[model samples]
Target chain A: GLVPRGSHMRIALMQHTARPLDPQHNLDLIDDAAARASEQGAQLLLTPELFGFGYVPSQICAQVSAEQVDAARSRLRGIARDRGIALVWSLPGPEGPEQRGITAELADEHGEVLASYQKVQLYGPEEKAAFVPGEQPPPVLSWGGRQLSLLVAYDVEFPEMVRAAAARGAQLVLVPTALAGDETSVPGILLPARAVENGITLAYANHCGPEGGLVFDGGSVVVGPAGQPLGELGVEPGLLVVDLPDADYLQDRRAELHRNWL
Target chain B: GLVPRGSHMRIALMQHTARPLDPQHNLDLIDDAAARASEQGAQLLLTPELFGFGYVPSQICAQVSAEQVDAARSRLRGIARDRGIALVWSLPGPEGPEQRGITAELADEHGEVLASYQKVQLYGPEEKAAFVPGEQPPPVLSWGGRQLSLLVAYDVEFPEMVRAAAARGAQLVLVPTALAGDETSVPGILLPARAVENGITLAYANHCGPEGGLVFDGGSVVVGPAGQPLGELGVEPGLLVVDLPDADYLQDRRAELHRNWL
Candidate 1:
């Protein structure tokens, strides 16, 4: 008889709109979400893009200082350490004459920053004016016997960035996004396709309700290796917890995915 | 006022099981399908992968001769000519020690062969044993003021092949598939993602009922540029006809698709 397999890791996604221009309120919500996630046995928590400062990219870039953003990051790391769970958070990256960008970081349970990613595909002209696009796709990071990568809102909509991550050996893809709720085709359709084609598990976290002029779509979801839905949320605030498939999970004939099918 | 837009072309797909190894019976079905499609004002008709000689690659290659395969192709062109509509059909391709392959051909209204494409990603080891993988992705063919390409079965399930077609200026993707009935995700999930990501209209036609040891799952579908369903057929024998989006259909930010998002 074969030995019993160990439990696969569990992850949580926080789906909610941020308090407009209120960093403290956003951090409080994340702190509570992390506490609940840790209590539920999630090893890490993923939040939406620019969640701590709301999704008003243009306004935040013009009004929120880089130091304030860093201060919020510090608090996020502290929450991860206190809750004893890893955290993925996105915010306005470092700024200068030409360094403005949207960035995300992965903080381990010990509150150590393990990896960083800059958004490669800026969504619209507002995003373009507010942030400089990253020169590279998300870096794959080693964690819990799996390889993972991060992507922001629009990057995941395009197949290239996701393919780039898969090409680099990513088994899990985490996306932090902001979109109008009307764009249901994204989480419901495109995200699932990405998971199936690449033979990986994908988690997408989105903001709910209106943030500034944009109504942040809250249709967050976790898709399995073969495009099967693990969990999904509609246009409401919620936390979605799901278990990751084992590293050896055979994904369709995409068992052939690691190499080019061509 | 601006000049009115021209009538968009309508296309039809035939979803039916083959008459086993009886190529003549299969051609009879195609003949009727073409007549019905043309009568209903469709400009073209698409059949499933290897619908003529049947999808049993190992058995087909062993029994059906290359000359007989060519004979089927000749008859397919005649149907297109008689019905005055273009036709897309797949069959057991040329045969030799190394040339045994599954291939598709596009025949125009006048019964002229316009384009040809071999299967790129063979589905299983049985197919690999019977056919060599296509050396190239489907070639983009100019037709009725649109750029189109063909991919067979397993090729459409992968993102790279579709992307390559898009990169080479394909606005319409025609897939001839033969999959199991339970593999619903291919049409419901993967096809739509391919359309949305590339901003291209996609039509997939699959075989229905049993064939050899496999039960061909007939879920034919037409997905719009934005991943919306235009038409779909269940596991029964039927014909699905749908209108195609214009070559200029704006496919989301995939309007940014022609150029690299990265």
Candidate 2:
């Protein structure tokens, strides 16, 4: 039977632990994770930022070349197309290009780019100076009648960016990150705030175990449009499936009272 | 020290038990109740509907004449003037060429008519037949910086009526009623529903004791603008005071939700 397209959208988050400075090895890891998610029947999947390449390696400049990054992008598109699953992942886009940040995308089962979101906002000096800032943010895309957006790790920290995405008709947002250290409550704090303020759902996938010079604290999260936390990921590599219902949680019923002020 | 001009407008609830057909006895009860209210420093005293002229009176000709009713009205005004307290009361107006129901009035401290309002909507068969129909609702009046409106028992059932009152700039609705039988849950449920739906406070007062061969359950209550229960009265003569803080409870609250256009 075909999947029922209703108010709820089922999704999964893949906690991909990227290898240090190796595109082929990281891509292989992503493939294994995708296979696991596909077996669990996740229509869409999310992985950590920069997993297609590598999260960090102070020697990223010496370890990987521009030619290798270009080949990884094609392989990622092909992987998504062959798997017949929509996946949101990030990769390092060009070496000589002024920036070295992430290039996030939502690719359909056909490997067609549904939405190409560049990380418009970078983190601190380490990110802003090293990566070429993405020019555009995640735009809403339809997946079986449901609309979804994309956000990188640091994008979740900013309110304006999230609001802008919501204003653009985004009902749910997917976040891919390489969160270092133990993040027991970052998702708990930020995910719900975003959902409550914008009246939309949020799904964040992060790295777990080890990756390059950092160990990502694997804590993925899923939230409803009403700021309700649906699920959270643990410190392991697995798939998390969530169903997003069609409900508007940001409607203010008491608006008349304010305008009727005596 | 001088009393604030608005600090103390006659704020009283017509909290007397009803006496239906016996107008003379009702008038006598009013005299005692008004004197008690005045002693307590109430600038304005309010009583339940048909306080002087009981609702659904069968003896229209013998027990109480029109002149006798008018005399009672004049006497109450005189008492208000003498006692230095404004008084508000409802009476069954004569079934003249006019079809509208009986008119209620706001009397000045010196026994002068300040504002008058006819029953906007007849409650049921008893009112539809015994009383003339009302035309328009009265405007919201600002006394002591608190916006106020007046309503009989049945008017509070509809959210639109309350919405209209709130839209007309009314923040606090002063209700007078002679509810027979049990309406405890009605006030506790509807009063707060109205406040939450419209974002305004309501000062509801109903008669406590038995009247007109009917036992009126006394569960008068005061609700804040945000629908919080401020004070309540029992089935006996009781006093309830509430200090409402000036707060905009409707500001930016997402109280409305819809599946169509978010």
Candidate 3:
């Protein structure tokens, strides 16, 4: 599923202010972010996890209905179409009777769904009780000749998840994360290491402002395949755009190591 | 081979200045390092890969023979016995007539061989031509109630190698490395992430100073189970001693995540 070498993709990562339980306000935020990103010549726009509905997983499951989620998804697709940009967003997905999971979706410029993935590695008990664990690894999709993979928040923290996605030929991994706390380890250490070690570009968009009793440290980053920082956003609402580099180093590194062992 | 929770072990990581292709000089260096580390109350002393024989693999095959290596190994074992401290060191392993590999041997305080590991992941063409890749994962050995795993240089650079060792019930991973260049990413990012991801402590002892047309950056580190830095060495000849913390966090974190998925 790997695209040809020298292929490049420009991605815009959104470090947006999340408004919990307020889908309409977050949608407007996304709309503004999409317009701004598209103006910056970004082909793809990535929003934070549960950007529209906020990151309050338990409350989302108890309050938001399946109808609301479906309606939001349709409008989000429309936003992508209207902005003429590929979009990635996360929300609480309805699974079964009173069960839900963190679901991330990618849509093309024409409002076509490219891929959808459920968050596999739940972070804590709150997440565990709020959603069902995704049973499979993230799906990789070919978009504009580049293979893209999706993960959410804590899923990106585990190197195994990203490694598995890269093993399946993902050139870029888009993660809609809602990292809370002042700890810079996730963004500073793990993100770059994951990108470099697996030889893949990674975009981690995070929620910035306070939401649901948590202070979201919006240190969003776009890391290149060589484990170097392409671009990064601070602890404020901003849009970071970076062009993905060619995967030649990645291929060379992968060829140098034992692919069978991984 | 899992050690019981609450067990602690003090480890010493040696960042030694290598004298290339000089086994006796390197042995004297290790002897001093072992004595100093033992004086600092370290139960185990870990040296950089090929610390006793230098890390010049290609030249080693041309200049050094199997007999010299065998004698150095015997004397290294004797040093451990003399210092009354367990030792871990790497050397040019005798595998065939024309090939050698990065081999690590762990010896007990009484000069008894505990475990030996061959470096599975060779770095580049020079290493590949000089050595054969190890066929299996490093074996885990229990010493003083701590389960230890061994790796060399680029092997620890791969996340999968450490993950496999952790899955095999290793609480601590010891790596003897010969990292070239002054890049802090390997020590600052990948090392900590590997420790925190697997909930295992890791000691990466590296060679310092100039050797074989490359400058070795001696940023050796001993990382705790929480991925926190217990101690670190700068780009100079030094000894770092740190007591290993209990693996409670690793166990709890593993229990919290999906064991089947990882």
TM-score of chain A of each: 0.90, 0.86, 0.90
lDDT (Cα) of model 3? 0.81
* iRMSD (Å), candidate 1: 6.8
> lDDT per residue, candidate 3, A1-262, as tens digits?
2333654567898897878888899999999989998888788999998888888878887888888898889889999999999999998775542677889999998889988888887777778778887767788989967899998888877776786688678878999998887868787767888987877889999998888889999989988866778898898989898767661223333322333333
Comparison by lDDT, 2 against 3, better one: 3
Clashing pairs in 3: none
lDDT of each: 0.82, 0.65, 0.81
Best by TM-score: 1
**Candidate 3 chain B, run of 10 with poorest lDDT:** B247-256
- What docking grade applies to model 3? acceptable
Extract clashing residue pairs from model 1. B254-B257
- Output the better candidate (1/2) by lDDT: 1
Answer with 2 or 3, whichever has the higher TM-score. Answer: 3
State how far residue A14 of model 3 sits from its true place (Å).
Answer: 2.1
Q: Compute the lDDT for candidate 2.
A: 0.65
True contacts kept of 3: 0.23
What is residue A70's positional error in candidate 1, in angstroms? 2.3
